[PDB]
Amino acid sequence: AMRQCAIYGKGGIGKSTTTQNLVAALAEMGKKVMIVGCDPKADSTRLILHSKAQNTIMEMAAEAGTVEDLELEDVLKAGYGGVKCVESGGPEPGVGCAGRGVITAINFLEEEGAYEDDLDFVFYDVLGDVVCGGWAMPIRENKAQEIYIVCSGEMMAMYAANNISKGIVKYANSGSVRLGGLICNSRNTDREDELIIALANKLGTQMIHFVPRDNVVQRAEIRRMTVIEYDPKAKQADEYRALARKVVDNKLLVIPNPITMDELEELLMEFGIMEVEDESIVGKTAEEV
Amino acid sequence: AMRQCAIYGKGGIGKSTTTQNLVAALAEMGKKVMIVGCDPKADSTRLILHSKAQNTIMEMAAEAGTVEDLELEDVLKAGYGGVKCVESGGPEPGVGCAGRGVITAINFLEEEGAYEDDLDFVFYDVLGDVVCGGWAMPIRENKAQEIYIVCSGEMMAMYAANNISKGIVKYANSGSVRLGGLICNSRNTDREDELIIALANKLGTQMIHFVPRDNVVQRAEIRRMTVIEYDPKAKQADEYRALARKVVDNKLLVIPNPITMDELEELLMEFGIMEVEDESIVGKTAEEV
Ligand code: SF4
């Protein structure tokens, strides 16, 4: 039974690297996996193919006229561990919906029989910042059931997590789209693990793993590869195996409970990211104080 | 003659603070200005109103049923220098186009006669990262003619600038939407000013100003106010006046020339942000090397 999963989360926090390393650990583990990149930047398959950039469905459709004109052998490319790799391409700037380009991509693969063909996992690496109806479309068209949110102990990455959660709550009644957990991509701030566990508890899910900051990640990715391929017996490689193992074994799939902005700030203030604001100096110049 | 302007740029680089300080410097200068916030986060008017958060059109429409049910006196709020302040509200998570929600807000103001009412400037603080058709709508529906891109000497902020430029190129023929320049929100990296000069040059525009990193920005914004109000004779306050003055005086309004990813990396490599990649170690493990 093929499990359709998605990795949602905002940019700049290392989401695609973690998606690729998790998927690599999962292929070393014997699983047949396909990565379908949905971020505007083509970064989701590079570490698997040792690529500078993969050719997207969007740019190859621009070349061949319409999407139907290209062959699957030009879209799907296998890399390390025989992990199949698709990159759908970003919205074409100024026009086009990010959501339409993503379902355009999904439907091409369905017809070309990429899903049917023996596969244990499908991972869509989707942008989850502003969860508009477009970036919410993999959830609405029920193309991904198990959503894992990459985030960190930072205000905007936590806010993005809560928005992705609100997205899932919106379509709870229409299907089987559920939140499988939070992955914390460490930024080495002090109470980060506890903070993301606290957020996961308010949301009704867990922190399925803490991925630490390790320089081997950078050493591996500068060679355009995952830590699993690069240095299989590193400390970090077992972190990715521990994440890959918990994902496989995961049964905690839920409808989350989104928190308010005040509650997001309570959690940030008590774990020391946010300072408590002093009411008395608001609106007052350096003259008054 | 009212000049309709927009500040485009990605998140996390201090865009809204610079928009607000520029607009404050412009009001000290005698101009009548309105800030219309278009980012999902309501941060665009807070420093002008000494607000924790302004009530958005989106949330007040949710309260009153439809957008027509609310009065302009509840949407537009005046702050420092009598700067009028609107916050349109983000896309409601999981649903809607972010672009449709933004132009719905602009149309509310048009009918309520906020533009007509003596105004020298209109500044829309818009998100410019993924320039999908939604976030490109102020450009397409020609609600803003002079677009200034906030960016910095960082890969994703430069990529975002080039995408906003491609957005403008798309609608060049349909109207008067032009690129007025790049504002660099300094991250204190070494060759940053020269890099954004060079980016602006490849793009066919200028770097209209360099906004440095100064602790007075943080001291002022923690009081929920602009450096212009907080300390009228700070070094930074004159930076904002210098930017405000060049904007007023600006005649450089161009259809930009977007660069390739390779060219974006040439510029980042020669200014020392990007390291040169060594081909020989790609795909090779720690065993080979
Ligand atoms: S729905 Fe979202 S991705 Fe699509 S055009 Fe609108 S803002 Fe863009």
UniProtKB/Swiss-Prot annotation, chains A, B:
PTM comment: The reversible ADP-ribosylation of Arg-100 inactivates the nitrogenase reductase and regulates nitrogenase activity.
Binding site for [4Fe-4S] cluster: 97, 132
Repressor recorded as keyword: no
Keyword Electron transport: no
GO biological process: one example: nitrogen fixation
UniProt superkingdom: Bacteria
Chain positions found as ADP-ribosylarginine: 100
Recorded GO MF terms: 4 iron, 4 sulfur cluster binding; ATP binding; metal ion binding; nitrogenase activity
Cofactor(s) needed by this chain: [4Fe-4S] cluster
Entries under SUPFAM superfamilies matching the protein: P-loop containing nucleoside triphosphate hydrolases
InterPro entries: NifH/chlL_CS, NifH/frxC, Nitrogenase_Fe_NifH, P-loop_NTPase
One of the Pfam families matching this protein, by short name: Fer4_NifH
Enzyme class: oxidoreductase
Cofactor binding, per record: Binds 1 [4Fe-4S] cluster per dimer.
Keywords carried by this UniProt record: 4Fe-4S, ADP-ribosylation, ATP-binding, Iron, Iron-sulfur, Metal-binding, Nitrogen fixation, Nucleotide-binding, Oxidoreductase
Catalysed reaction, written as an equation: N2 + 8 reduced [2Fe-2S]-[ferredoxin] + 16 ATP + 16 H2O = H2 + 8 oxidized [2Fe-2S]-[ferredoxin] + 2 NH4(+) + 16 ADP + 16 phosphate + 6 H(+)
EC numbers: 1.18.6.1
Induction entry: Constitutively expressed during log and stationary phase in sucrose-limited cultures, its levels decrease during stationary phase (at protein level).
HAMAP family: NifH
More about this protein: This subunit is associated with the molybdenum-iron nitrogenase component 2.
Family: Belongs to the NifH/BchL/ChlL family.
Function, as annotated: The key enzymatic reactions in nitrogen fixation are catalyzed by the nitrogenase complex, which has 2 components: the iron protein (component 2) and a component 1 which is either a molybdenum-iron protein, a vanadium-iron, or an iron-iron protein.
Protein name in UniProt: Nitrogenase iron protein 1
